[PDB]
Amino acid sequence: FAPAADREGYWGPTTSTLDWCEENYSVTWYIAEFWNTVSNLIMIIPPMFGAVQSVRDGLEKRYIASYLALTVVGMGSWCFHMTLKYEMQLLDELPMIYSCCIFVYCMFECFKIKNSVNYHLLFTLVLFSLIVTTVYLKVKEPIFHQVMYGMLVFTLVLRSIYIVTWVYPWLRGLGYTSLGIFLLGFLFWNIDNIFCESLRNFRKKVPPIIGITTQFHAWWHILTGLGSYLHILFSLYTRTLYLRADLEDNWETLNDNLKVIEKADNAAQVKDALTKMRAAALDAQKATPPKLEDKSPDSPEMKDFRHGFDILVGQIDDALKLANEGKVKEAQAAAEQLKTTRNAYIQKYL
């Protein structure tokens, strides 16, 4: 037909190489494509809460950068979908390549020694994103960006498939949920693109989700923001399982800290050794000592090993109580008590 377009354009002309099938400045004069802008919050707020928990918990820098990169992508999308200029378009698109390169560094370095750097992979990813950036700006074709972004997502999918198959079967539910909702999101990306018809919104009830649920590029921000959040969880869990201590480690820590308390000269050592000992005690209590590796977790010898740990833990908790009450000399005196309870109930099984 020959009628008035539904794009009620405002606040400057669209200087971007692409415009989505959401009516320009249709809800408000402030932003072009409203749901494509407000639907980016679950990619700005959740990854910002992850980056701050990751710093508080003292995690490896690369997992903090991963969460921050996803927030940078979120803000760039919110800005591209608000203005629709080329400057804010690249702030959505280019970070996607870089954040995906951070993800490939983490996924491929997950079984490496702590405090090591792979300068080979690092300069390779830096070169790939520099080459991709240079050609992307020169020849301004957005399908080149989409194929380059999509090839990093591809290697990241194969590396995550190797891990869930050969190394950590447990992460299957998370790894495949991350992938399922990302490919559902990518189906919705192609629906808003190919099925370009503002019929359902124009027909009935636009204010409730009757009209709003047919914004399939808004759904893509939800699903890919949620799928990219789940991929960082997956990545960080692969590193947590790898770096995790076993019975031999927890038995050593528990006893090292028992000697720190005995020989301690100040309140801060005593409280730290009691806290570290309590964590190692709860962890050791779950394991089966090597003398009992042939028995059931419910055997009388196993229930007794666990019983001694229960007694030991309550005692560590009593000594921590003394520490927090300022009874330093007394909390320190628990070391002899704690040695006696590992001798009487635990050490026979080790």
Among Na ion, Ca ion, Mg ion, none, partner that 115 touches (CB below 5 to 8 angstroms by kind):
Mg ion
The contacts of residue 285 (CB under 8 Å, 6+ apart) are 305, 306, 309, 310, 313
What dihedral do alpha carbons 148, 152, 155, 159 form, nearest 10°?
Answer: 180
Cβ-count burial 233-254 (b if 16+ within 10 Å, e if not): ebbbbbbeeeeeeebeebbebb
Does 217 count as an annotated binding residue?
Answer: yes
Cβ 62 to Mg ion shortest distance, Å: 8
Does 22 count as an annotated binding residue?
Answer: yes
197 binds Na ion (CB under 5 A): no
CA distance 229 to 106: 14
Cβ 280 to Mg ion shortest distance, Å: 22
Cβ 342 to Mg ion shortest distance, Å: 32
113 binds Mg ion (CB under 5 A): no
Binding Mg ion (rule: CB under 5 A), the pick from 2, 58, 114, 209 is 114
Among Na ion, Mg ion, Ca ion, none, partner that 248 touches (CB below 5 to 8 angstroms by kind):
Na ion
Q: Which is nearer to Mg ion, 44 or 69 (CB)?
A: 69
- What are the tokens at 118? 């792979």
Does 33 count as an annotated binding residue?
Answer: yes
Cβ-count burial 92-103 (b if 16+ within 10 Å, e if not): bbbbbbbbbbbb
Q: How many CA atoms lie within 13 A of 156 on its CB side?
A: 26
Which stretches does DSSP call E strand in 13-131?
none
Site track for Ca ion across 20-39, x = CB under 5 A: x-x-x---------------
What dihedral do alpha carbons 94, 100, 101, 103 form, nearest 10°?
Answer: 150
19 binds Ca ion (CB under 5 A): yes
58 binds Mg ion (CB under 5 A): no
The contacts of residue 325 (CB under 8 Å, 6+ apart) are none
Does 307 count as an annotated binding residue?
Answer: no
**Four-residue CA torsion sign, 267, 273, 276, 279:** negative
Q: Which is nearer to Mg ion, 116 or 266 (CB)?
A: 116
Of the listed pieces 101-109, 194-202, 243-251, 297-305, which binds Na ion according to CB under 5 A? Answer: 243-251
Does 19 count as an annotated binding residue?
Answer: yes
Q: Classify 8 as helix, strand or coil.
A: coil
CA distance 152 to 145: 11
Does 190 count as an annotated binding residue?
Answer: no
Among Ca ion, Mg ion, Na ion, none, partner that 6 touches (CB below 5 to 8 angstroms by kind):
none
Does 170 count as an annotated binding residue?
Answer: no
Of the listed pieces 113-121, 122-130, 197-205, 232-240, which binds Mg ion according to CB under 5 A? Answer: 113-121
* Contact positions with Na ion (CB under 5 A) in 9-28: 19
Q: Which is nearer to Mg ion, 117 or 194 (CB)?
A: 117
248 binds Na ion (CB under 5 A): yes
CA distances (Å), origin 256, targets 99, 108, 221, 277: 41, 34, 50, 9
User: Which residues contact Mg ion (rule: CB under 5 A)?
Assistant: 60, 114-115
Residue ranges in contact with Ca ion by CB under 5 A: 19-20, 22, 24
Known binding positions for Zn(2+): 81, 217, 221
Instruction: List binding-site positions for Ca(2+).
Output: 19-20, 22, 24, 33
